[model samples]
Target: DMPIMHDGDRYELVRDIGSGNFGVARLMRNRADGQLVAVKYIERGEKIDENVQREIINHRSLRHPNIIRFKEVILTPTHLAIVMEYASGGELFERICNAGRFSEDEARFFFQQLISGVSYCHSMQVCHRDLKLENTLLDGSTAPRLKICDFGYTPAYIAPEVLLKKEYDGKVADVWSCGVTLYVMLVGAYPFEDPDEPKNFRKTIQRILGVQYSIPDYVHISPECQDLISRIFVANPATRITIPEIRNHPWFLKNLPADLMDMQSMDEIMQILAEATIP
Candidate 1:
């Protein structure tokens, strides 16, 4: 139950943690160091897929405390297994729903942490294509630190022309997804959900594509937050606010409890974590 390895050589699988379209994830303990890890299994041939390969390469190159850590990659005859840090805390979606959405102060703190993680990823030229509360994991304690997880949808960076010719804007698409995540976090529901027309989902897609969705008063988020969300949701890649701008935004700076912009090292992050308690 402690050291989990797939090859029956290095580690042993303790228990299944999660699963998705790509593969199954298990909580494994490393035999060498006695460290808990999350192992993801990918079908052998499927690892050759463009998306899968991109994810692997991107994750291998990217390193950030806020982002999940990739410990080892095991290539087996039948499948590929990736070992990463094990997060015992559950998804942020469940926590938010159970808490009935976050209060303004609470949301501000969490949102700042979320942006910090995204900023780090963007700096590495990696865009998380699918970002939502469901993909955010928290620590086991009451003031749990947020960690960004699930990088299956992230696409490798490419030139804008190449992206356009391929009919995809990876970074901008990620920004849109981030906007959606922010909206959901603020409102506790998806903005595009329409009960009247369940089958005809194209309308919602259109709004997202056009970045033309209205903010309701019931949302309860600050005007600055709404503004930032709108800017990120822009349909045009050229007009979208870049990561630097987001970092400089007054909302982000003001909401952040401390000087996140000045802290650049892992030591600084550890200090912040030690001082700041998540409520």
Candidate 2:
């Protein structure tokens, strides 16, 4: 069990909603504003204390509509808690898994939103190193809104021009992760997973880095989708496509759901196109 802080009188813990290796997330209600928040409690004695501080600072600085909002930070004698906007809707990966596969139109709708959020983060010089369906949370109601969370691996840096010169993998790494995410959404499985040691995580990493996995023939996705994935997942990071190129990809543009680009609700999108007669 994770410990909770009373914090004098500002916040009160409701209950634990989630837990992971680093910390436990609790649903808490802020007494000051009566707003519900997710409090990530990190024990001070845990491994990599400095890394935790850097992650907290990085996440707190990020502000984008699609990115998870970090409300504030609270420190106690034994632990540090990072409070963020609670995304009660749950993970997008689970939703896709339950549905088998997402329709092309549906995939495009969500992809557009994901990329928009990603692009905004990139613009702010934040690279979400790990972007997967599991990191994306949906509001769970009709017209679900996607929110990207889990910033542990997000790199804190300045603009791309400056970052590119450094001896690091840089911003394009996030693009590759996003491409993998897209493929996972459409195919409902990872491109590379070994059965011998099903959890042989290193093999999957090799596959991603080598770009050696083949898209299953059963996936009737568009060629443009394949092309984008190929380009983004290219082994040579130097030549990989950027976010702007992704946004301009013909496949994404051609199949973009009307509601997504216009930022309209699902019902409004249907209403706007309901009168169109298809030949």
- Full-model lDDT, candidate 1: 0.60
lDDT of 1 by residue, 1-279 (tens): 212345545566677754532235677777777767777665544334656555756666556656676666655444455667776666766677887666666766767777777777766764434543336777565766777764663111122232345566555555555666566567665656453664455665554444455667765777788789778765567788876687788877884656466402435433332332211
Backbone clashes, each candidate? 7, 0
The top-ranked prediction according to TM-score is 2
**Candidate number with greatest lDDT:** 2
Candidate 1, pairs of clashing residues: 2-29, 3-12, 3-29, 4-11, 4-12, 5-11, 5-12
**lDDT on C-alpha atoms for all candidate structures:** 0.60, 0.64
Instruction: Give the local distance difference test score of model 2.
Output: 0.64
Q: How many clashes would you count in candidate 1? A: 7
What are the runs in model 1 whose C-alpha is more than 4 Å off?
Answer: 1-13, 17-22, 30-35, 42-57, 74-80, 126-134, 150-168, 195-199, 209-212, 255-259, 263-279
lDDT tens digits by residue: candidate 2, 107-224: 7777887888887776665443553433678754566778877476221112232233555455676776677667768887766655355566666555544566676788787777
Residue 240, model 1: lDDT of 80
TM match of model 1 to true structure = 0.68
lDDT of 2 at 123: 68
